[PDB]
Amino acid sequence: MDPELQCIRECRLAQLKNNSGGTNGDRNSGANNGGGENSAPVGAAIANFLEPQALERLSRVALVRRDRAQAVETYLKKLIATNNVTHKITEAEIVSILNGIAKQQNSQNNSKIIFE
Numbered sequence: 001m002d003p004e005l006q007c008i009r010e011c012r013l014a015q016l017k018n019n020s021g022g023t024n025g026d027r028n029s030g031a032n033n034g035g036g037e038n039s040a041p042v043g044a045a046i047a048n049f050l051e052p053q054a055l056e057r058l059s060r061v062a063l064v065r066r067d068r069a070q071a072v073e074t075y076l077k078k079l080i081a082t083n084n085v086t087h088k089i090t091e092a093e094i095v096s097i098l099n100g101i102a103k104q105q106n107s108q109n110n111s112k113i114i115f116e
């Protein structure tokens, strides 16, 4: 329970020991080993659960209201992590949930602020 702490722990582990060269911002993929033989499910499996065109939608709104976009991705994660899942999110699905999230909301914003 309370996966709030475990969440940061997941990214914290990745933030430890890195490299990838770096140097300002310019490198955006190209040639790097990862999977190879066999399949490749893992998180990559959820990346396909989002249509290509729909992928742009969540990206577009996020640039304006990441708070709502954050809940949309969380909705699918719960479905995929649980089992309820049974459909590939779409531009309408993202918007549909986003529209429903704005109705329920939570209490306030407090977004991109806990970043410490």
Ligand SMILES: *SCC1=CC(C)(C)N(O)C1(C)C
Pocket: 007, 008, 010, 011, 073
């Ligand atoms: S809880 C913070 C968080 C959630 C998820 C979308 C899995 N992430 O990549 C971060 C670690 C930012």
Ligand SMILES: *SCC1=CC(C)(C)N(O)C1(C)C
Pocket: 010, 011, 012, 014, 043
């Ligand atoms: S920990 C950073 C991170 C993990 C993952 C869930 C793959 N993400 O989308 C970000 C880049 C936020």
